[PDB]
Structure formats: structure tokens, C-alpha cells
Amino acid sequence: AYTNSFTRGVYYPDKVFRSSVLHS
Amino acid sequence: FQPTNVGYQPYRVVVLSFELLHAPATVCGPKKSTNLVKNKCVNFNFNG
Numbered sequence: 001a002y003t004n005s006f007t008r009g010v011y012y013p014d015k016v017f018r019s020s021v022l023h024s
Numbered sequence: 025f026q027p028t029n030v031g032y033q034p035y036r037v038v039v040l041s042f043e044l045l046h047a048p049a050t051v052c053g054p055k056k057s058t059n060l061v062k063n064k065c066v067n068f069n070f071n072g
């Protein structure tokens with residue numbers, strides 16, 4: 001069987017703090 | 025490998041690879057820490 005993942009599976013890309021920012 | 029072998033001799037190689045990332049440090053140079061100072065302009069150094 002299959003299903004839609006939606007917006008799952010984002011993770012923290014690096015061990016650094018950031019706030020109020022849009023990081024690519 | 026025979027002792028009569030210069031370039032044909034064995035060499036022991038150690039490669040040190042450094043995990044120079046932003047996690048907690050755990051392997052450090054022999055440098056002694058100071059006390060910590062606040063609200064004053066300081067020439068600081070944390071983990072390097």
C-alpha cells in the first residue's frame with residue numbers, strides 16, 4: 001500500500017541556533 | 025617487506041580527521057580556561 005507524505009520529513013539541517021529567519 | 029628494501033620500505037601512517045562541527049566540543053588543546061566575565065568588552069574564546 002501507499003499514502004501521501006504531506007509536509008513530513010523536514011529536519012534541523014545543522015547543529016546551530018537561528019531565530020526569526022528564513023534559511024535556505 | 026624486508027629490511028633490504030628506500031621507497032619500497034613499510035611506513036606507519038596515522039591520519040587524524042577532525043570533526044570540526046558545531047556540536048559540543050570533547051577533544052581540546054591544553055589551553056587553561058579563565059573565569060567568565062559579563063557586561064564588559066572582552067577578547068573572548070569559547071572552544072576555539
Ligand SMILES: *[C@@H]1O[C@H](CO)[C@@H](O)[C@H](O)[C@H]1NC(C)=O
Nearest residue numbers: 001002003004005006007008
Ligand atoms: C500516489 O499514490 C496514489 C494511490 O495511493 C496514486 O493515485 C497517485 O497517482 C500516486 N502518485 C505518484 C506520483 O506516485
